[PDB]
Design a protein around this ligand. Sequence first.
Ligand SMILES: Nc1ncnc2c1ncn2[C@@H]1O[C@H](COP(=O)(O)OC(=O)c2cccc(-c3noc(-c4ccccc4F)n3)c2)[C@@H](O)[C@H]1O
Length: 431
Amino acid sequence: DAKNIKKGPAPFYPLEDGTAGEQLHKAMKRYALVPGTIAFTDAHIEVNITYAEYFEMSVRLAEAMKRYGLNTNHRIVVCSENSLQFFMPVLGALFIGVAVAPANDIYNERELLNSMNISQPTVVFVSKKGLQKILNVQKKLPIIQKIIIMDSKTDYQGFQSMYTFVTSHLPPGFNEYDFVPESFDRDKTIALIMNSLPKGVALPHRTACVRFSHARDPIFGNQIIPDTAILSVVPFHHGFGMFTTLGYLICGFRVVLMYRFEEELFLRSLQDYKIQSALLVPTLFSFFAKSTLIDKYDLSNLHEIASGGAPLSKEVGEAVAKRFHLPGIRQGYGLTETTSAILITPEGDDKPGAVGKVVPFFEAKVVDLDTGKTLGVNQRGELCVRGPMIMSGYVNNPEATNALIDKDGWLHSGDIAYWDEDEHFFIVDRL
Ligand SMILES: Nc1ncnc2c1ncn2[C@@H]1O[C@H](COP(=O)(O)OC(=O)c2cccc(-c3noc(-c4ccccc4F)n3)c2)[C@@H](O)[C@H]1O
């Protein structure tokens, strides 16, 4: 019964051709040509980095990786707290079809070993503070030939930085504005291997390309408007942080980052950077439902606060929205296996307690926990989704893949949900 399969509407903008790398390259090149355009700001150390710096360094890393010998048969790991440098190797690798496997930087050596044993990287990009953990893992994973330090300018403890690595491999006369990213089959070439013991979630470039349609959608994303600034405290190595941030770069936004939550810094950053949109997780919503300091700050530029990654009660949401003088909360629901959010609060059409509506290109249904049948409006069952951001599979684990995704393409979330007569979805429980 089609009437009971909720479908997203048409994208405000058609899906662009090209790989995720090509699409990011093209957008960032444009922003780079406007001096002073800010890509990232570190709220802790206060430093800004422009699109020109980001673009040039990401292109130089792409070419250097290529010259070192990396191609679509290789993976890299990026292991780092949120930082100005985090996205440099991500973008560089996307530019040349090298799969990127972000590794949780609070993993211990064991979860880290499990992660990198699944992703099997040739080169590991790591922050200074993760270097020891990586050296220890490398002792067991000899495929790791090269370790590069992300947040250093010079060599660091005998290891090259991104800067000296690039200088080691760039051809003479290399021109970052003549560079052309690689073109390949975006359905078959993996962009990201994200972690779910966790599994590896393989995401073709196609999925990021669909994300980039959503990100700039005036209803399901953020309208592109000059001088937009986001405050993001969510981890970049997780799908919530990874795919919001890539979308923000596509949009030319200023992404102000924190890698440690602090109440005063967070509020003062909202005020002082005139933030339009802030990204939190539900436990930080409970935090701000307790906060009394919010009204000591001028937050009149703030348009939205976004949440995802876990259940948010409608009353905690209403309390936070009210404290921040917002009409509502911008929720998103997704899994690592769906790349990004596939239910998102439509702009101007928020409903407290809802997780939003089906995004463009997707469909969602809820099925009876007994009859496996599709249910109608206001009926609770297991949420299933189908669409072009669904993972190609768990890495080297097709049994787990088959257990999650059935023959007709439906991903069975394991979450209990219902949808209402406006086609808003409510997550209500889990199996
Ligand atoms: N809104 C929600 N409400 C209730 N439960 C939720 C939920 N979101 C996730 N869950 C639970 O967590 C499990 C999945 O846990 P992973 O670690 O695998 O994955 C993520 O959490 C994830 C991955 C990618 C993107 C996002 C995301 N969240 O918000 C946004 C977002 C918001 C605004 C705008 C744009 C956005 F992308 N993106 C979250 C589910 O089975 C479900 O049980």
